[PDB]
Design a protein around this ligand. Structure first.
Ligand SMILES: CC(=O)O[C@H]1C(=O)[C@@]2(C)[C@H]([C@H](OC(=O)c3ccccc3)[C@]3(O)C[C@H](OC(=O)[C@H](O)[C@@H](NC(=O)c4ccccc4)c4ccccc4)C(C)=C1C3(C)C)[C@]1(OC(C)=O)CO[C@@H]1C[C@@H]2O
Ligand SMILES: Nc1ncnc2c1ncn2[C@@H]1O[C@H](COP(=O)(O)OP(=O)(O)NP(=O)(O)O)[C@@H](O)[C@H]1O
Ligand SMILES: Nc1nc2c(ncn2[C@@H]2O[C@H](COP(=O)(O)OP(=O)(O)O)[C@@H](O)[C@H]2O)c(=O)[nH]1
Lengths: 382, 139, 432
């Protein structure tokens, strides 16, 4: 199958209220439509998406999309896939003001918690429920940021040095000396998340009082241990859950960037453009060989350009299944950025994932041979 | 002075600036002769077409130059619809490089946003279309 | 003003730099003692690009010399231009790398890198507005590869905005002088592909071919090769130093040459070349220079440009010439050999012209080409690398100094990815 997509419309923000503006995004079911304020009665545009969330209201239930609804639609399925044995990935996208952080982190005070808190809550709830004598679980966490082509750890305390990126020949890219921490209670992961959000690098700008200056990646490694001592073995299934918050495209002149802020914006834009190029290339690549003939034309995707694409090698393509969450600003002034977000979300829809579960081939071959001898025994016994 | 063929379009306005020993009788006769010819096409909604100015100071000659000393000189400023053609050529080149995002990271690394490219292109397309309608014959 | 800082590492880099300094000095008129003895007034106008003032109306070059063997430093000091350099910039140690990349990069170089960086900071602080760096070294060696790569990494960390260049001598296909060339070359390219902003690929085999076929010499030595390389190095950055009709800063060359960040490997060339005793036959002009410049025999990279396509190209002329002739010739070259130029770049020839030609050359031209055919070179190294890594031929010497097989594997993968990228555009079709 392909990538999942969940577009969401953001409500007005005071910058778009002091300057007069109008709603432009409409949507019904799977379809989302935009009209060009530039010249109306010219060419309304529409796009198809698996999931779409309206958030202009809140007390009323008229197509309102609570964070819990978004979680139940995406994160529940992804947690189930993780328990099945697939590595799974969520990544947010949009522009400064879209609302990617609102969806990921949400607000600690509010009951409306973001995707990652609710996923952790449900994961620990199922761990508590399904623990038994013959079934046990292990969970460990990690949290990293990409500031300007440098990986920085968050749970690790103040450490002026950076962390090197190395490629294991079999397991692919990874980061060396990431403070990988275990967890046994929801309080521990909650405190770790709070500390990580505290230590993140954040700066203010005209588009958002508290904007993000760095991409953020939250990773959970989850192990199932089946301990029927008579028959089964432990550490059967290992799964990886990744949750990615990307920085919003900076328009420079509209954001009032200057000095260091401008250089941060430039680096963010370079990373985002590289991400767009890979996404388009990978989409074209999977689309072509799938329908054209089957030749496996050797046009390879290039991920070694930025650390963001390099570290997300597996999630974009390989043994991972994933979803894109594109936030949207309804203000008429933000027309071109909204169109770019829509087009790249549509392109991301064309991408194919190939998540597959793997275990020790010796054990798999032993089980297959056991099934074969069982079949032959049933044949001759009959 | 620009590699475009004026015959493929229509002349919309013309200013002539004369320097030196020139008389209005001669320029009137010249304008009549140019109006007679068929290769020069004027849009229907500009029945006059021409503006004329005359100055007494003849042009000078720089030492070590290449132009000769002359008694009469003319400068024409013509507003035609042939220009578009040149613009069209340039647009083609832009597309051939923007399909692959070549050289874009240099621009992005200095504060530019990617989308700012596309907008400009669309803007250019708008101007060209308004230079193809301003010349359509009236009905 | 645009100041350049120059660094030299290893035997090859030091000798090339010595010959290069002996050249630039003549172009600007500096005696071996330091005093200025020239004729024209343009020579002092932009002398601060390379030289610093000193109280006795003296000029000292802005160079840094690096090694881990005093022999090369002694040879350079005991020479015609030994007294021109600042003594404090002679950074060196003992117990050299011994043709081992690990010793250069991890064990021995890690001690001297701090002193080298202190000297670099002191030199760069005094500059009014620093433009970029440039470093000369050899990839197939020990000291050169390791210490040059380490210095490049550190300087890129400290000065992320400025330009970095490199004039690196790569291993040749057949004329070999070290048994463990492939390991050092691969480990060095793995970092050069990431850190630096431009790279010019020199090969000894190409220089010998030029010397024997074009120059018609009988006993070429390393002095002549250093001459050719110095000529090219001086010609690349002429427009910072002399006036002209179309200037070309280093940054402008960087923007026009590389279309994507990872493809910054170039083949250089210089024209003309009359081999002497036959100067009276050849008529020197613009089309003759263009004819000699695009020919395959002239290239210094030891790779045929006819096996690929030119991603793009830049030409820097020096002389008094007409602009129409230059533009017409570049257009003619593009239209005639239409197969060998990529088709999705409508015009892929950058042009610059400067008014002051070399001392005794009414005209000259420098060539910087960026073509897919360079992939061949990398493939050779990669093949040889595999032939020695499948059985771990000489690996223990590296592992004793604090490395592991993972480093070799990732370096090989990165170079293979580079080869694949360059090959993606090489074939025809592609188009839209
Ligand atoms: C007598 C005469 O003019 O003959 C030429 C000559 O025959 C040719 C063959 C010269 C000659 O070059 C060589 O023979 C040569 C040998 C080994 C490596 C490289 C070159 C020449 O030696 C080289 C010499 O070049 C220069 O002097 C330049 O100004 C050049 N010189 C240096 O590189 C230099 C070296 C050490 C100290 C100072 C300068 C230069 C370029 C830029 C800035 C400053 C200087 C020139 C024109 C000639 C001879 C003498 C035969 C050529 O070289 C240059 C750089 O001009 C080889 O290709 C050119 C074409 C010339 O026609
Ligand atoms: N559904 C929503 N309901 C209420 N406020 C929202 C909603 N979506 C977004 N916002 C608000 O929109 C503002 C910006 O959201 P944010 O997530 O910071 O945007 P972004 O596009 O992710 N940019 P950045 O902060 O740099 O990551 C905040 O005030 C959010 O609370
Ligand atoms: N072009 C050129 N190449 C050289 C010169 N001297 C040595 N080399 C090359 O440098 C390589 C050896 O590198 P080396 O200088 O020993 O590296 P180092 O030991 O780290 O300084 C050999 O392949 C030689 O061909 C020179 O003067 N000119």
């Amino acid at each position: 199958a392909s990538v999942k997509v969940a577009v969401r419309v953001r409500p007005f923000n005071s910058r778009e209220m002091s300057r007069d503006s109008k709603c432009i995004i409409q949507m019904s079911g799977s379809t989302t439509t935009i009209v060009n304020p530039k010249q109306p009665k010219e060419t309304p545009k529409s796009f198809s998406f698996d999931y779409s969330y309206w958030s202009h209201t809140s007390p009323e239930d008229i197509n309102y999309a609570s964070q819990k609804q978004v979680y139940r639609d995406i994160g529940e399925e992804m947690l189930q896939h993780a328990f099945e044995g697939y590595n799974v990935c969520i990544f947010a996208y949009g522009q400064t003001g879209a609302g990617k952080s609102y969806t990921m982190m949400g607000k600690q005070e509010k009951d409306q918690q973001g995707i990652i808190p609710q996923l952790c809550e449900d994961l620990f709830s199922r761990i508590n429920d399904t623990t038994n004598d013959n079934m046990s679980y292990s969970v460990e966490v990690s949290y990293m940021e990409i500031y300007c082509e440098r990986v920085r750890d968050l749970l690790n305390p103040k450490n002026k040095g950076n962390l090197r990126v190395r490629e294991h020949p079999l397991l692919g890219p990874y980061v060396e000396d990431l403070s990988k921490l275990a967890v046994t209670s929801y309080n521990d992961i909650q405190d770790l998340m709070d500390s990580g959000n505290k230590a993140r690098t954040v700066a203010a700008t005209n588009m958002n009082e508290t904007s993000s200056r760095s991409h953020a990646v939250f990773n959970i490694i989850f192990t199932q241990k089946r301990h029927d001592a008579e028959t089964n073995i432990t550490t059967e299934k290992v799964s990886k859950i990744s949750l990615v918050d990307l920085a919003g495209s900076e328009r420079a002149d509209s954001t009032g960037a200057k000095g260091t802020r401008l250089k941060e914006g430039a680096n963010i834009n370079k990373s985002l453009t590289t991400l767009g190029k890979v996404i388009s290339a990978l989409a074209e690549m999977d689309s072509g060989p799938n329908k054209n003939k089957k030749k496996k034309k050797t046009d390879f995707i290039l991920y070694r350009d930025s650390v963001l694409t390099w570290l997300l090698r597996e999630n974009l393509g390989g043994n991972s299944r994933t979803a894109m969450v594109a936030a949207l600003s309804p203000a008429d002034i933000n027309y071109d950025e909204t169109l770019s977000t829509l087009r790249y979300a549509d392109r991301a829809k064309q991408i194919r994932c190939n998540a597959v579960i793997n275990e020790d081939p010796n054990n798999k071959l032993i089980r297959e041979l056991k099934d074969e001898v069982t079949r032959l025994r049933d044949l001759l016994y009959a | 002075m620009v590699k475009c063929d004026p015959r493929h379009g229509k002349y919309m306005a013309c200013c002539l600036l004369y320097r030196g020993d020139v008389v209005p009788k001669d320029v009137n006769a010249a304008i009549a002769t140019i109006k007679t010819k068929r290769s020069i096409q004027f849009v229907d909604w500009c029945p006059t077409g021409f503006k004329v100015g005359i100055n007494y100071q003849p042009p000078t000659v720089v030492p070590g130059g290449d132009l000769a000393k002359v008694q009469r000189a003319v400068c024409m400023l013509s507003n035609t619809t042939a220009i578009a053609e040149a613009w069209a050529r340039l647009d083609h080149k832009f597309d051939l490089m923007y399909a692959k995002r070549a050289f874009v990271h240099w621009y992005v690394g200095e504060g530019m946003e990617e989308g700012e490219f596309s907008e400009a292109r669309e803007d250019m397309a708008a101007l060209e279309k308004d230079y193809e309608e301003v010349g359509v014959d009236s009905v | 003003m645009r100041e350049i800082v120059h660094i030299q590492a290893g035997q090859c880099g030091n000798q090339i730099g010595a010959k290069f300094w002996e050249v630039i000095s003549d172009e600007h008129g500096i005696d071996p003692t330091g005093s200025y003895h020239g004729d024209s007034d343009l020579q002092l106008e932009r002398i601060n690009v390379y030289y610093n003032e000193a109280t006795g109306n003296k000029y000292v070059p802005r160079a840094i010399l690096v090694d881990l063997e005093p022999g090369t430093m002694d040879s350079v000091r005991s020479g015609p231009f030994g007294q021109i350099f600042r003594p404090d910039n002679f950074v060196f140690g003992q117990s050299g790398a011994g043709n081992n990349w690990a010793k250069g990069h991890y064990t021995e170089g890690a001690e001297l890198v701090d002193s080298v960086l202190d000297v670099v900071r002191k030199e760069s602080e005094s500059c009014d507005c620093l433009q970029g760096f440039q470093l000369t070294h050899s990839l197939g060696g020990g000291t050169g590869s390791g210490m040059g790569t380490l210095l490049i990494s550190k300087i890129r960390e400290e000065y992320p905005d400025r330009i970095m260049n490199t004039f690196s001598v790569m291993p040749s296909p057949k004329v070999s002088d070290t048994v463990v060339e492939p390991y050092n070359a691969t480990l060095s390219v793995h970092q050069l592909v990431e850190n630096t902003d431009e790279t010019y690929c020199i090969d000894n085999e190409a220089l010998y071919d030029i010397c024997f076929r074009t120059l018609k010499l009988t006993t070429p030595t390393y002095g002549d090769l250093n001459h050719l390389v110095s000529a090219t190095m001086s010609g690349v950055t002429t427009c910072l130093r002399f006036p002209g009709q179309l200037n070309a800063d280093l940054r402008k060359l960087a923007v026009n040459m590389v279309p994507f960040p990872r493809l910054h490997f170039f083949m250089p060339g210089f024209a003309p070349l009359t081999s002497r005793g036959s100067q009276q036959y050849r008529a020197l002009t613009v089309p003759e220079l263009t004819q000699q410049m695009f020919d395959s025999k002239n290239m210094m990279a030891a790779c045929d440009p006819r096996h690929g396509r030119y991603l793009t190209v830049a030409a820097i002329f020096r002389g008094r010439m007409s602009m129409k002739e230059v533009d017409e010739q570049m257009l003619n070259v593009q239209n005639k050999n239409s197969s060998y130029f990529v088709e999705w770049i409508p015009n892929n020839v950058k042009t610059a012209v400067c008014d002051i030609p070399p001392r005794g050359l009414k005209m000259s031209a420098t060539f910087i080409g960026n073509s897919t055919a360079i992939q061949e070179l990398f493939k050779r190294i990669s093949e040889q690398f595999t032939a020695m890594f499948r059985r771990k031929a000489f690996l223990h010497w590296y592992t004793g100094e604090g490395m592991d097989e993972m480093e070799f594997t990732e370096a090989e993968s990165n170079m293979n990815d580079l080869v694949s990228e360059y090959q993606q555009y090489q074939d025809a079709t592609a188009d839209e």
